Amino acid sequence: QVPVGEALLGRVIDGFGRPLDGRELPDVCWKAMVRQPITQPLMTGIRAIDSVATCGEGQRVGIFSAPGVGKSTLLAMLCNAPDADSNVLVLIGERGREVREFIDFTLSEETRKRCVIVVATSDRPALERVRALFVATTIAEFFRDNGKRVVLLADSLTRYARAAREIALAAGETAGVFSALPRLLERTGMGEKGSITAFYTVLVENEPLADEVRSLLDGHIVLSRRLAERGHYPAIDVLATLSRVFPVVTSHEHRQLAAILRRCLALYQEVELLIRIGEYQRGVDTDTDKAIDTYPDICTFLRQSKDEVCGPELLIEKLHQILT
């Protein structure tokens, strides 16, 4: 059984649904191919995402990263999306210290009050790690039916998959969990009086699961080890990041700005080596010249403090100031 209710907000529970917060659980209830179309933006307040890869209310999105690139801080920022009512975070297969750090020092007090956090660490049984995602999805669905815009954050599908495989290896004693992964992903999305927008993390570089998850979702955000080592945070690789609902949830003004931005990064990347070895010559190529002049402002725009939440009005204004 899964505990559901508005009173779970601000609580931390496990794969079965037992409190981990040093207190007893409150009084709460126990519980296809396409969904409704995605038509409304869900602003994250993260400028790199909202500018060129705008998410949709009810979208499912994969976050692809290597270890130690600031994925946790990105997830904490996603918890502060101005367009969401509440959050369901599910943390599967990480070590105790890492998870403890995350909840106590990375998530603020204000953010935690708006989350239900479901935790199944690596030291827990494979069955618990797998059950954690079923529980989180059911809790998110209950909020959706109460007419909330829910954000579901799942870290990670990779460790979920590892736990599911462990269960398959023990299926002999004594055996729809084995086919569950695509059905869980399809349980999120738009609904009558509500929505679930979902971010699922995938570890690289494991490799086939990433391919399976790409075929199932509506966009991908790619984190880059290179950016992270430069101290460029969130370490989002813009040119490798895509949102399938981008053309439908944005304005024309927005789309034009985003195109200038991508063009600049693409032009810059092609000439990056020439610059690094000091062989670039101005006047040569005007477009690239403009890209290079524009590049430092774009980098500043993309790098974002974990405490800064940027709404859409300000977003558009900053893009104009640097690109136009």
Side-chain angles (χ1 to χ4, degrees), residues 2-22 26 30 32 34-35 37-172 174-191 194-204 206 208-280 282-283 285 287-289 291-324:
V2 175
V4 175
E6 307 285 327
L8 284 179
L9 294 171
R11 306 301 308 265
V12 189
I13 64 181
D14 72 349
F16 303 106
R18 319 163 179 144
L20 271 53
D21 31 16
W30 294 82
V34 275
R35 205 151 283 257
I38 295 165
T39 73
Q40 303 294 329
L42 179 89
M43 292 304 167
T44 63
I46 297 157
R47 298 186 300 261
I49 293 173
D50 293 349
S51 60
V52 301
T54 320
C55 301
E57 188 184 334
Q59 193 176 10
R60 311 154 302 175
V61 172
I63 297 170
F64 299 86
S65 59
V69 301
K71 181 184 43 58
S72 287
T73 301
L74 183 53
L75 296 181
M77 290 165 90
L78 286 166
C79 284
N80 301 137
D83 284 347
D85 296 315
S86 52
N87 302 290
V88 177
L89 291 71
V90 56
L91 308 178
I92 294 158
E94 250 183 327
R95 302 191 176 274
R97 166 159 192 178
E98 303 173 13
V99 163
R100 173 184 72 90
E101 295 307 290
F102 180 71
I103 295 169
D104 291 324
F105 305 135
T106 306
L107 303 180
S108 64
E109 174 183 33
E110 316 86 74
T111 300
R112 280 171 70 180
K113 294 170 174 185
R114 305 179 58 251
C115 301
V116 301
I117 310 184
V118 177
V119 177
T121 51
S122 62
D123 58 82
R124 305 305 293 133
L127 188 66
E128 178 166 23
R129 286 179 267 128
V130 166
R131 198 174 159 78
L133 182 60
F134 286 76
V135 171
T137 303
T138 296
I139 293 180
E141 288 177 317
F142 177 79
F143 284 136
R144 178 170 68 188
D145 290 347
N146 285 269
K148 304 309 173 172
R149 301 177 177 92
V150 190
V151 171
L152 170 69
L153 299 183
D155 187 32
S156 66
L157 283 192
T158 294
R159 306 269 211 264
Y160 170 89
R162 279 173 197 173
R165 175 171 180 280
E166 288 176 22
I167 298 177
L169 285 166
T174 172
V177 53
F178 305 116
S179 67
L181 187 51
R183 287 192 307 267
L184 287 164
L185 305 196
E186 288 171 317
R187 287 165 66 181
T188 58
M190 276 294 291
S195 57
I196 303 161
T197 310
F199 298 85
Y200 299 90
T201 67
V202 178
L203 258 318
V204 287
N206 285 16
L209 170 64
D211 278 279
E212 182 182 347
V213 164
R214 281 214 52 173
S215 84
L216 291 184
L217 303 196
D218 312 322
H220 50 273
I221 299 170
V222 171
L223 303 183
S224 165
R225 196 161 52 259
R226 24 272 103 139
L227 297 173
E229 287 168 345
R230 284 190 233 157
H232 180 116
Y233 287 111
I236 295 170
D237 185 339
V238 168
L239 291 171
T241 289
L242 197 147
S243 164
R244 297 299 307 265
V245 298
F246 182 77
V248 68
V249 301
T250 57
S251 70
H252 181 73
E253 169 182 17
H254 191 158
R255 285 192 302 276
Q256 295 180 146
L257 291 166
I260 294 171
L261 194 165
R262 286 188 178 276
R263 184 176 313 121
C264 283
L265 292 181
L267 289 170
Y268 188 83
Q269 282 222 242
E270 286 185 0
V271 77
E272 171 185 82
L273 189 55
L274 277 173
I275 295 188
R276 187 159 78 172
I277 69 176
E279 288 275 12
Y280 187 73
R282 300 195 76 97
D285 175 348
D287 288 315
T288 291
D289 285 329
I292 291 173
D293 294 339
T294 313
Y295 182 74
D297 285 339
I298 291 165
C299 284
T300 296
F301 173 84
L302 293 173
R303 291 187 275 98
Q304 180 168 347
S305 164
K306 62 192 160 195
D307 306 295
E308 170 66 28
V309 179
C310 184
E313 295 175 12
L314 178 59
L315 180 81
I316 292 306
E317 175 68 27
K318 296 166 98 72
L319 285 165
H320 273 301
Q321 287 305 116
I322 63 176
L323 305 179
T324 290

